[PDB]
Amino acid sequence: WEPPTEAETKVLQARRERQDRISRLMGDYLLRGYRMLGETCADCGTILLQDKQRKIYCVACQELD
Amino acid sequence: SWEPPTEAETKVLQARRERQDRISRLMGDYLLRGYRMLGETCADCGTILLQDKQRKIYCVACQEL
Ligand SMILES: [Zn+2]
Ligand SMILES: [Zn+2]
């Protein structure tokens, strides 16, 4: 052990907050009526949602970044 | 019409949320136990990568979940 760097602690806390936000958005859109698909985003790994027969949506890529 | 989320969906959501919480907890622990964060995400799953003290690269999601 040496202590994690301050960099590593910020990135870990960021990564935490991000994932929390992604779960919260996915939940929001499921509640708003979006369909969960059995596929994940090829870019970021996030489970994909579908809005009727209008579109497929990644809450990460297409909203949070 | 709008339709609720299904039993399936809200299960997968709770699961994804648990996964992500565990990834963060695992990542943190490895950081505190001597593993250094890489500026790079797992190509399979998107998770930030670590290296151990023998410079093996290590994805907590892939190689422990
Ligand atoms: Zn994505
Ligand atoms: Zn991985």
Residue numbers in the entry:
A (entry chain B): 13 to 77
B (entry chain A): 12 to 76
Task: Reproduce text from the manuscript describing this model.
The human SSSCA1 gene is located on chromosome 11 (11q13.1) and encodes a small soluble protein of 21.5 kDa with a predicted N- terminal zinc ribbon domain type 2 (ZNRD2), and an unknown domain in the C terminus. We describe the general domain organization of SSSCA1 and identify three distinct domains including an N-terminal zinc finger domain, a disordered region and a C-terminal domain and describe that this domain organization is found in most eukaryotes and is highly conserved. The C-terminal domain has a dual function as we here show the inclusion of an unusual nuclear export signal (NES) that overlaps with a docking site to the poly-ADP-ribosyltransferase Tankyrase 1 (TNKS1). Functionally, SSSCA1 is largely uncharacterized although it has been linked to mitosis and centromere association.
Human SSSCA1 N-terminal Auto_anti-p27 domain (residues 1–111, predicted MW 12.5 kDa) was successfully overexpressed in E. coli and purified over a Ni2+-affinity and size-exclusion chromatography (SEC). The purified SSSCA1 construct was predicted to form a dimer based on the elution time when compared with a set of common standard proteins after SEC (estimated native MW of 24.6 kDa). The crystal structure of N-terminal SSSCA1 was determined at 2.3 Å resolution and phased using the single-wavelength anomalous dispersion method, based on the anomalous signals of two zinc ions. The asymmetric unit contains two protomers that form an antiparallel dimer with a buried surface area of 1960 Å2 (‘Protein interfaces, surfaces, and assemblies’ service PISA35), the interface is highly positively charged and is mainly formed by the helical part of the molecule. Each protomer binds one zinc ion coordinated by four conserved cysteines (human residues Cys53, Cys56, Cys70, and Cys73) structured around four antiparallel β-sheets. We were not able to model residues 1–12 and 78–111 in the electron density map and coincidentally, these regions correlate with the intrinsic disorder prediction plot of SSSCA1 and confirm that these residues likely are disordered in the protein crystal as well. A systematic search for other proteins of similar architecture using available online services, the DALI server, PDBefold37 revealed that SSSCA1 likely belongs to a novel Pfam family of Zn-binding ribbon domains (Auto_anti-p27, PF06677) which overall fold is not yet available in the protein data bank (PDB). The helical dimer interface has not been observed earlier for this type of Zn-binding proteins and the closest zinc-binding protein relative from the zinc ribbon domain 1 family (ZNRD1) do not share this. We have determined the structure of this Cys4 zinc-binding domain and discovered that it belongs to a new family of undescribed zinc-binding proteins denominated Auto_anti-p27 (Pfam PF06677).
